Design an enzyme around this catalytic site. Structure first.
Site, short mmCIF file in Angstrom:
data_model
loop_
_atom_site.label_atom_id
_atom_site.label_comp_id
_atom_site.label_asym_id
_atom_site.label_seq_id
_atom_site.Cartn_x
_atom_site.Cartn_y
_atom_site.Cartn_z
N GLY B 69 -4.69 -2.92 -22.98
CA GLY B 69 -5.41 -1.77 -23.00
C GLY B 69 -4.42 -0.39 -23.24
O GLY B 69 -4.91 0.88 -22.85
N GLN B 70 -3.17 -0.87 -23.22
CA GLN B 70 -2.22 0.17 -23.50
C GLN B 70 -2.26 1.12 -24.78
O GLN B 70 -2.98 0.47 -25.81
N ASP B 71 -1.62 2.33 -24.72
CA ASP B 71 -1.68 2.97 -25.84
C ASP B 71 -1.02 2.55 -27.10
O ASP B 71 -1.38 2.29 -28.22
#
Ligand SMILES: Nc1nc2c(ncn2[C@@H]2O[C@H](COP(=O)(O)OP(=O)(O)OP(=O)(O)O)[C@@H](O)[C@H]2O)c(=O)[nH]1
Ligand SMILES: [Mg+2]
Lengths: 177, 180, 18, 415
Positions: B69-71
């Site tokens: 779910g990281q950018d």
């Protein structure tokens, strides 16, 4: 050709994936720009077969500078492979981590380098020393911050005399530059 | 042509199915995948790239592709959407600030023409604290009832406890597999 | 037989050197 | 400290390349071919090339140039040693060194190249060790490389413990056109093909002059090698301490010791050449071969090569012993003899015409070289005393050794 290779690499068949990898390797050796298929091979990277893992690592190393942006999808795979029980897999992962000429790739590989610095296997120790030397050559400041000089110096007075020689050579190369 | 071999293979189980692992970071997606595959809550490093694993249940090998779910990994979910038949979204009911981000990410993922045949799989992650929402409040906040032409199911699963994973897997199998 | 000199048995050490 | 070692081709195409440091661009290989072509056309071609600030050291292989480009002031000797080790590994793995095997074992070739060296520093160089971890038809790395004994793999089991030695002698004589020998050096070669069970520690013992003098037995015939080089498994500490050649024999054929000293004895074969070459009319080949070796030793396959004229044609051979054949490709006549017993005197009388038109440029006077090879002959007189084969388990070994005498740099300067 390219579309067929991409379709074969995006399949769930191990024989087809191996054939696609062999074809890509042959094209790369014959003088074919296979860097465009690097993102497709990124998904087909975490494979149990050691032959396919070596080919994927070689393609990533040869396609790392060409597509630095696409190399960000291999940090997790490298981290997972750095803890592989097989010493050959760990050595290959250590060599590939130091062989990738990515400014943002070596930053995330500092933890794997520190973990592999104290590897008990003499081959693992030599691979960790080589990776540390490569990181220092690419980024001397990063190597100094990671504190790999102390680990390299202590490797000389340890067992694994081949690993000790590799660490001594790495320390001399770091001091040479 | 003859389909005797196909019938023989299907008599003892031939269908496998697929699944996806998407959601916000620290939303239990990796923990949910580990529970589905292994069955224990093991702490793992942040998913910089992606996790590839397969889970076999009810004679169907539902492979799960973990996505961070990281950018830097949020826009990479489109790469894993290719050759994927299912998708499981892990919501963070304990992260009110991140609830809006998770809902926006789910809407963006479901607003793609390529990802149309994959039914919605909303898992109420972090369902172990009093701050976690129920199976209807989370869906209402995420607007799962307004996902037309999408089979979305809201299920509450606790990573520490593991309850509700079997129900979610059964619901996914029923949505995908339409046989006896 | 073999060209280049037939193979001959070799001792273990110099018995006359103790 | 080569940046990347690559294998080229006869047409300039790189058969396979593998960068080790990444400090040198892969496009520098293309400019290597034009540089080599320019050097060859001007006589300035050298194995170690130089493309600006990056040096592209290349080695002439069987079919491709092993170009090892380097950027900094890396060890030239180290680069040459690494290239030689890679060539030996390729020869061991692939019986053919050409483009046929370069593009046929790429999957295993890339793995072998990656495992051999990393970051420009070689790590694996044992052919057996490399084959035990990388194969063309993978487990963890063997403990032999990590262990101190990297030249004797443990656990080897054989039905019989037989070791075949080879006392190879190279007789090189540099006889000038005046009839005097200038360079007369004989280089020994003690190569043993050890095939036994386990990892026995060989205890080499011979009639060495230094050892005989140290032991007080410096009165018999002892071989005094000017230069003695031990094998990798041979412990240099024992040799420096008391000349004790104690080392673990390798699994297979290996070179334990190689003597190298000057020779002050008469040549094994005395060849005198007479050139009765007329002025564009005819040519005379008064070649007489005298066997200076012992009569009990026969020089098998003796081929005394006498360089004939480049433009000579219609030659006639009038010899006594040994067939004479003129090869147009070699531009010389070789006095081939199947068996050449010691003390034999072979006289030949060559006669051939010459073209009426004189040659535009001179062709030189290449030296006359013979290919005499008399086995079971010990010109140096060095006799092996004993071979201490000791194993932890305990077994009775039956080592064997054969002495072979051949002609090396036995070239006689032409008149
Ligand atoms: N301890 C605990 N953690 C939970 C629970 N439910 C969800 N989690 C979250 O699950 C996470 C497990 O981390 P990971 O294995 O990396 O899986 P993830 O949540 O997808 O995180 P990323 O892989 O980085 O995207 C923890 O960080 C928690 O925030 C729970 O009931 N107990
Ligand atoms: Mg995860």
């Amino acid at each position: 050709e390219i579309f067929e290779l991409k379709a074969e690499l995006n399949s769930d068949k191990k024989e087809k994936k191996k054939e696609a990898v062999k074809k890509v390797i042959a094209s790369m050796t014959v003088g074919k720009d296979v860097s465009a298929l690097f993102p497709d091979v990124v998904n087909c990277m975490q494979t149990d077969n050691l032959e396919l893992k070596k080919l994927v690592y070689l393609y990533l190393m040869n396609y790392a500078k060409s597509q630095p942006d696409m190399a960000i999808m291999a940090v997790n795979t490298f981290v997972k492979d750095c803890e592989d029980p097989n010493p050959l897999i760990r050595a290959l992962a250590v060599r590939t981590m130091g062989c990738i000429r990515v400014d943002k790739i070596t930053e995330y590989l500092c933890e794997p380098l520190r973990k592999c610095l104290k590897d008990e296997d003499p081959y693992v120790r030599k691979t960790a020393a080589v990776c540390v030397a490569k990181l220092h050559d690419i980024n001397a400041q990063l190597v100094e911050d990671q504190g790999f000089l102390d680990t390299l110096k202590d490797l000389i007075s340890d067992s694994n005399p081949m690993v000790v020689a590799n660490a001594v050579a790495a320390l001399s190369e770091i001091a040479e530059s | 042509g003859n389909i005797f071999a196909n019938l023989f293979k299907g008599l003892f189980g031939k269908k496998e199915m697929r699944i996806l692992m998407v959601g916000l970071d620290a939303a239990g997606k990796t923990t949910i995948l580990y529970k589905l595959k292994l069955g224990e809550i093991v702490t793992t490093i942040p998913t910089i790239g992606f996790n590839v694993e397969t889970v076999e249940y009810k004679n169907i090998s539902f492979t799960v592709w973990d996505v961070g779910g990281q950018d830097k990994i949020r826009p990479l979910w489109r790469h894993y959407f290719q050759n994927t038949q299912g998708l499981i979204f892990v919501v963070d009911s304990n992260d009110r600030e991140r609830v809006n981000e998770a809902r926006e990410e789910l809407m963006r993922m479901l607003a793609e023409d390529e990802l149309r045949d994959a039914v919605l799989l909303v898992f109420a992650n972090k369902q172990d604290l009093p701050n976690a929402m129920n199976a209807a409040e989370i869906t209402d906040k995420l607007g799962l009832h307004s996902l037309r032409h999408r089979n979305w199911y809201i299920q509450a699963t606790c990573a520490t406890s593991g309850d509700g994973l079997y129900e979610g897997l059964d619901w996914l199998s029923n949505q995908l597999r339409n046989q006896k | 037989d073999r060209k280049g000199g037939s193979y001959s048995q070799a001792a273990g050490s110099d018995s006359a050197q103790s | 400290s080569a940046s990347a070692v690559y294998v080229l081709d006869l047409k300039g195409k790189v058969l396979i390349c593998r960068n080790y440091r990444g400090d040198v661009d892969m496009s520098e290989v293309e400019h290597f071919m034009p540089i080599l072509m320019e050097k060859e056309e001007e006589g300035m071609l050298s194995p170690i090339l130089a493309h600006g600030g990056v040096r592209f050291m290349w080695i002439k292989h069987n079919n491709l140039y092993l170009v090892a480009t380097s950027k900094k002031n890396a060890c030239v000797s180290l680069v040459f040693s690494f290239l030689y080790k890679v060539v030996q590994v390729f020869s061991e793995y692939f019986k053919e060194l050409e483009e046929e095997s370069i593009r046929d074992n790429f999957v295993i070739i890339y793995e072998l190249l990656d495992e051999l060296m990393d970051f420009g520093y070689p790590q694996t160089t044992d052919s057996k060790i490399l084959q035990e971890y990388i194969t063309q038809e993978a487990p963890r790395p063997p403990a032999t490389v990590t262990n101190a004994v990297s030249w004797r793999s443990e656990g080897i089991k054989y039905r019989k413990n037989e070791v075949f030695l080879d006392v190879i002698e190279a007789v090189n004589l540099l006889v000038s056109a005046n009839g005097n020998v200038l360079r007369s050096e004989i280089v020994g070669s003690i190569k043993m093909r050890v095939f036994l069970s386990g990892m026995p520690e060989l205890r080499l013992g011979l009639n060495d002059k230094v050892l005989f003098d140290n032991t007080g037995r410096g009165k018999s015939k002892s071989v005094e090698l000017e230069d003695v080089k031990f094998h990798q498994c041979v412990r240099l500490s024992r040799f420096e301490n008391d000349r004790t050649i104690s080392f673990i024999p390798p699994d297979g054929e290996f070179e334990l010791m190689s003597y190298r000293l000057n020779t002050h004895v008469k040549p094994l074969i005395w060849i005198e050449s007479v050139i009765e070459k007329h002025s564009h009319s005819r040519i005379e080949y008064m070649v007489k071969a005298k066997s200076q070796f012992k009569r009990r030793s026969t020089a098998n396959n003796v081929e005394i090569h006498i360089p004939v004229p480049n433009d000579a044609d219609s030659p006639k051979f009038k010899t006594t012993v040994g067939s004479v054949k003129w090869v147009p490709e070699n531009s010389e006549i070789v006095w081939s003899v199947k068996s050449f017993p010691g003390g034999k005197e072979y006289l030949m009388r060559a006669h051939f015409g010459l073209p009426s038109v004189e040659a535009e440029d001179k062709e030189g006077k290449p030296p006359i070289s013979v290919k005499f090879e008399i086995p079971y002959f010990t010109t140096s007189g060095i006799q092996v005393r004993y071979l201490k084969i000791i194993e932890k388990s305990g077994y009775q070994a039956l080592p064997w050794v054969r002495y072979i005498t051949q002609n090396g740099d036995y070239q006689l300067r032409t008149q």
